[PDB]
With several copies, the nearest count.
Chain A
Amino acid sequence: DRLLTTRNGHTTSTTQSSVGVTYGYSTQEDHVSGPNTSGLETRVVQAERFFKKHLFDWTPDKAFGHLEKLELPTDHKGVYGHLVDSFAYMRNGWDVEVSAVGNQFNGGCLLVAMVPEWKEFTPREKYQLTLFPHQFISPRTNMTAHIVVPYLGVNRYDQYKKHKPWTLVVMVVSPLTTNTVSAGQIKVYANIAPTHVHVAGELPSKE
Chain B
Amino acid sequence: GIVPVACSDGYGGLVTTDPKTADPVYGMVYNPPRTNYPGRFTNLLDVAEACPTFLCFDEGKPYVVTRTDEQRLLAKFDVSLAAKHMSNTYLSGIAQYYAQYSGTINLHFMFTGSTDSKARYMVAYVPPGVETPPDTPEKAAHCIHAEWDTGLNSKFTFSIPYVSAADYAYTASDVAETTNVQGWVCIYQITHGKAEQDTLVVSVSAGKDFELRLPIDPRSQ
Contacts and interface: CB of A to CB of B under 8 A. Distances in A.
- Asked if the two chains touch in their complex, CB atoms less than 8 Å apart, one says yes
Interface of A: 24-26, 28, 30-31, 34-38, 40, 64, 86-89, 104-109, 116, 123-124, 127-128, 130-131, 136, 138-141, 150, 152, 154-159, 161-162, 173-174, 177, 179, 181-182, 200-207
Given A109-B112, A179-B114, A36 B142 contact: no
Interface in B88-103: 88-90, 93, 102
Question: Nearest 5 CB-CB pairs, A to B?
Answer: A25-B39, A88-B127, A127-B88, A201-B127, A155-B165
Contacts of B83: none
12 contacts: A26-B38, A36-B167, A38-B161, A108-B112, A127-B56, A127-B88, A155-B165, A158-B165, A201-B127, A203-B130, A203-B143, A205-B134
A122 B49 CA distance: 23
Nearest to B52: A130
A92 B102 CA distance: 24
B53 A156 contact: no
B116 A105 contact: yes
Interface residues of B, number: 61
B114 A202 contact: no
A203 B139 CA distance: 9
Given A130-B203, A204-B140, A105 B114 contact: yes
A25 B116 CA distance: 37
A61 B179 CA distance: 44
Chain A: interface secondary structure? Answer: loop
Interface in B30-70: 32-33, 35-39, 47, 51-54, 56, 60-63
Contacts of B88: 124, 127-128
Nearest to B56: A127
Contacts of B75: none
Interface of B: 32-33, 35-39, 47, 51-54, 56, 60-63, 88-90, 93, 102, 104, 110-117, 124, 126-130, 133-134, 138-144, 154, 161-167, 178, 183, 197-199, 201, 203
Contacts of B142: 86, 202-205
A201 B130 CA distance: 11
A130 B126 contact: no
Contacts of A128: 53-54, 88-90, 93
A93 to B, nearest CB: 10
A142 B199 CA distance: 17
Contacts of B144: 40, 202
A163 B162 CA distance: 21
B39 A130 contact: no
Contacts of B162: 35-36, 38
A79 B46 CA distance: 41
Nearest to A28: B36
Contact of B38 (A30, A31, A36, A162): A30
B70 to A, nearest CB: 19
Given A37-B163, A89-B165, A174-B63, A152 B127 contact: no
Given A34-B167, A157-B165, A177-B197, A204 B38 contact: no
A29 B169 CA distance: 24
A64 B57 CA distance: 12
Contacts of A159: 128-129, 165, 178
